[PDB]
Each structure stands twice: as C-alpha cells, then as structure tokens.
Design a protein around this ligand. Sequence first.
Ligand code: NA
Ligand code: NA
Ligand code: NA
Ligand code: NA
Ligand code: NA
Ligand code: NA
Lengths: 105, 105, 105
Amino acid sequence: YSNAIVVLCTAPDEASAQNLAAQVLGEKLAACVTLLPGATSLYYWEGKLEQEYEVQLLFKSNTDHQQALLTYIKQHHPYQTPELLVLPVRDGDKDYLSWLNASLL
Amino acid sequence: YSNAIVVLCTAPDEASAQNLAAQVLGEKLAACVTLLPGATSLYYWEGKLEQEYEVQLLFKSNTDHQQALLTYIKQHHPYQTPELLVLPVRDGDKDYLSWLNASLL
Amino acid sequence: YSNAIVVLCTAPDEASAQNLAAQVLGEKLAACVTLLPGATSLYYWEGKLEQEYEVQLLFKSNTDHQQALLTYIKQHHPYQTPELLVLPVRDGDKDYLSWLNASLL
Ligand code: NA
Ligand code: NA
Ligand code: NA
Ligand code: NA
Ligand code: NA
Ligand code: NA
C-alpha cells in the first residue's frame, strides 16, 4: 500500500466547502481538495429522514498528515459532527505521489 | 482499519436513486446515502460502447451490515446487475463513526 | 478483498475525459468509467493557490489490469502529471464482479 489517502467529507454549500479547502491547503494538510457540488444526502437525524443538498469533498493527502487533517477539518467545519472517512490508497502513479508528498507540511 | 465502509453503486436517475436510498435508510442498512447526479458512465454492454447518464451513489455503512446492504440493494435496484463495490475505510473521526454505528440495525 | 479496484483521476473538461474513457475502454483496461463533471479542485501549483473546474473520473477495473491501466492513462492524458490513485475494493456483488472481470480478460 502507498501512503496516500483520500478523505471523504461533506459541506452544506459551495461557499463553506471552498473556505474549508482553502484553509486546509494553506495549512498544507492536503495536496488537492476536490469538491462535487449539487449532491444530495439522505440520512436520519434525531429520528427524522432528511434529504439535503450538500457538497461531497475529496481531500487527497497522506498518512503522515492524516490526524492533523482530520483534527483541522473537525475544528473548522460548519457541522458539529462532519463526515470524516479516510479511504486507503493501494497504489498510485509515482510522479503524482511525489507531487502529493512534496506539497504537504 | 475502522469498521466503516463506503459502497459505490449507480442508478439510472435521481428518482430511482432517492427511492433506493430511502428504503435502505428505513431498513437501517446504511447511515447516510449520498447521490451525485448528472454523472456520465461509459462501458461496453453486449459488445457496444454505451455512454449514459447515471447517478453515482455512496452508501456509508459498516462491515457488520455489509452483506445485508449488498443483498438489499441487489433485490431493490432498477438494474439486473448493479454496480456494488465496497470500499474499506481505514479510519475516521470518532464522533462521526459513533453516529454512523449507532444509526444501524 | 476482491480483485476489483477504483482508480481516481481528474481531467480538465468533459471532452477530454470522454476521449480518455473511450480509449481506455477500447483497450479493455477498465470495465466502466464514470465521469463527475462540474467539479472544483483547489491546490497549490508553483506557489499559487489555484481553483479550477475539473471532471472527477472513476475507472472501475481489477488488480489484474492495474499497472497496464495506470501506464495507459499516463500516456493518454492531457496533464503531464495526472492524478492516479488506486482504491482497493474489499468486496462487491458476485454478478457485478463477474461482469467486470469478464469484460477485461
Ligand atoms: Na465562491
Ligand atoms: Na470561495
Ligand atoms: Na453536477
Ligand atoms: Na424521491
Ligand atoms: Na466525447
Ligand atoms: Na484478448
């Protein structure tokens, strides 16, 4: 396995998604943050089935910066309990991983 | 590795995607279902290259509910052979994982 | 773990993403390619924070064709150093996995 990771997270709108991405990148806690706006999420919250528009984010980072990234997002997110799921990366293109690794703190 | 999983699946349109998600959620087989509408999928089917609009779904659940979820979607999907790929989750925010686990059957 | 994989990659626009997908599929190096257009990616490039539109791609393939797929994309991509991250697949629907494998043999 490579040391790269892809962290999934959602935001209520593009404005908040962009602000969070900019903060994370300025702190060098991710190499690239990709936003997928216009998503819809369904889930139960306090006993009711909700259906809300959200932005699905993908934070591309590495294991050496994993906890710092999670902690940062958790403390700079509009939601109290944001989605934060780390996907492992089994392999990647050498040159891309090189760039990803070099971009981080 | 945490016990969380993210299941990839596609649906032909938002209406079918929403119905499936609502059903899975009511059955408590996923904690959150995110729909990414307006995607385009290319693939060969019966020897012909097809290019079709689809909704990419992400079902956020755990390994304990993995088989029931897969079986449920398979039996309640518009396609005869739907995409069902389980991505493992290496780690996550504990508060989020706690809510995810608590929302399941 | 199954032998399936999901490879993340981004393209600058739909035209280029579609051409790449078609080429990869003709070469039988992926069973299905899903395009998520209208995404926004933020990243530092040459010291400056960029915010650009991209298409997020998901190549659904197997470990048996993983290196050939990565090499092929790298040689047929508009970017000099494109994003190429391989996500492992823990499990999936038997019929879907069978179709994916058969499509590439
Ligand atoms: Na803006
Ligand atoms: Na902004
Ligand atoms: Na869209
Ligand atoms: Na609906
Ligand atoms: Na095209
Ligand atoms: Na052959």
